[PDB]
Design a protein around this ligand. Structure first.
Ligand SMILES: O=C(COC(F)F)N1C[C@H]2CCC[C@H]2C1
Length: 185
């Protein structure tokens, strides 16, 4: 792909984080803590899952960023509407305002309803995410495999401002403690 020139500097929004997340000082890395991180509750925080949003809001244009997923067993990545549900249980789907892929139990899937199997020969250590607001496109790229396409959501109905979306996953296994990291431009 040739989307690298639309690179944007994403930072994480502490106020949206689940209360167990630890966001680095530079707001570029997030991981699961082993306990509540001693913050007050607020209506923005994802309550049920280890999720956080980027601070940036996008309503036009083309945007690209990269995320490091090295040695994680489980995670979700993509974009979502600014007005997604924060509290209780929900599925990741375009109907609920999410355009995402994930790793879970040694398989990669796109967050369609129902979910779509992905065909990845080279397990990615870094994922590129491209959004074309006007075209209604969200695409995912395998940076470890020379930028190969993973998945394209097209005919997207955003229906609002978009925010970068992250889920570090639970760590029931003890094998999923590693952070998500926003990679330098
Ligand atoms: O955004 C989409 C589909 O495009 C892309 F995601 F593949 N949508 C929005 C959802 C609400 C109506 C049915 C669902 C279709």
């Amino acid at each position: 792909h040739h989307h690298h020139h639309h690179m944007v500097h994403i930072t994480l929004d502490r106020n949206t984080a689940n209360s167990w997340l630890i966001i680095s000082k530079d707001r570029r890395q997030v991981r699961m803590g082993d306990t509540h991180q001693n913050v007050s509750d607020n209506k923005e925080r994802f309550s049920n899952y280890p999720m956080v949003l980027g601070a940036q809001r996008f309503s036009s244009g083309k945007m690209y960023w990269e995320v490091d997923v090295t040695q994680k067993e489980a995670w979700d990545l993509g974009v979502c509407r600014d007005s997604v549900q924060r509290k209780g249980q929900f599925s990741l789907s375009p109907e609920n305002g999410f355009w995402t892929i994930w790793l879970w139990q040694d398989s990669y899937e796109a967050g369609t309803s129902p979910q779509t199997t992905l065909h990845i020969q080279v397990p990615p250590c870094q994922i590129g995410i491209f959004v074309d607001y006007e075209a209604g496109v969200v695409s995912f790229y395998n940076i470890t495999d020379h930028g190969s396409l993973i998945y394209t959501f097209s005919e997207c109905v955003f229906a609002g401002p978009l925010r970068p979306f992250f889920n570090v996953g639970f760590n029931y296994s003890g094998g999923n403690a590693a952070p998500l990291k926003l990679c330098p431009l």
